[PDB]
Design a protein around this ligand. Structure first.
Ligand SMILES: [Ca+2]
Ligand SMILES: [Ca+2]
Ligand SMILES: [Ca+2]
Ligand SMILES: [Ca+2]
Lengths: 144, 16
C-alpha cells in the first residue's frame, strides 16, 4: 500500500545507513550514522537497536525489514518525548529554531548532499510564519 | 535520480 514516492524515500534513507551498499545495515553502520547525528550510542545500544528491527535473527537489517519498520513508524502517532528529542538533533545551537544551515548540516553528515534550494524546500514543509526556519511549534505541527 | 526525503519522513528515521 506504499506509493512509489514513499518507497523511493525509504530506499534513499536506507542508503544513508547501508554505506557499503551490501544490502544490510550492521551495528557498525548504525553507529556511524548515529555518531554523525551527534549521538554516542554504546555497542549494547546499537546491538539492541539492530536486533529489535531484525526479523530473522541474522543480526542485520535488510531493506524489507527496514520497510516494515518505516511503514509502521509512519502510521504510528509520535510521542511528545521523541519529537522533543528529535528537534534537539537538528537545533544544534539550542536557539529554538532549526535553520536551513542546521538542516543541511544534518543531511550532509548523514551522507545526503543537498542543494540550498532542496534544503529550503524541506524547510517550507514545516515553516508556517515564513521566516525560513522551523521553531518548535512548527516542528510539532509537522510531526502531528 | 535524486530522491528527496521529505522532512517529516527524515524525522521519523531519526526517532529510531
Ligand atoms: Ca551494509
Ligand atoms: Ca535480518
Ligand atoms: Ca538552531
Ligand atoms: Ca518559522
Amino acid at each position: 500500500q506504499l506509493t512509489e514516492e514513499q518507497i523511493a524515500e525509504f530506499k534513499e534513507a536506507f542508503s544513508l545507513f547501508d554505506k557499503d551498499g551490501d544490502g544490510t545495515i550492521t551495528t557498525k553502520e548504525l553507529g556511524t550514522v548515529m555518531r554523525s547525528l551527534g549521538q554516542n550510542p554504546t555497542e549494547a545500544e546499537l546491538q539492541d537497536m539492530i536486533n529489535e528491527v531484525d526479523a530473522d535473527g541474522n543480526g542485520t537489517i535488510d531493506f524489507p525489514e527496514f520497510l516494515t519498520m518505516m511503514a509502521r513508524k509512519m502510521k504510528d502517532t509520535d510521542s511528545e518525548e521523541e519529537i522533543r528529542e528529535a528537534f534537539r538533533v537538528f537545533d544544534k545551537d539550542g536557539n529554538g529554531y532549526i535553520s536551513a544551515a542546521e538542516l543541511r548540516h544534518v543531511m550532509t553528515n548523514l551522507g545526503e548532499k543537498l542543494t540550498d534550494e532542496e534544503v529550503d524546500e524541506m524547510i517550507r514543509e514545516a515553516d508556517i510564519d515564513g521566516d525560513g526556519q522551523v521553531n518548535y511549534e512548527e516542528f510539532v505541527q509537522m510531526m502531528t | 535520480r535524486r530522491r528527496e526525503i521529505r522532512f517529516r519522513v527524515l524525522v521519523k528515521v531519526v526517532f529510531f
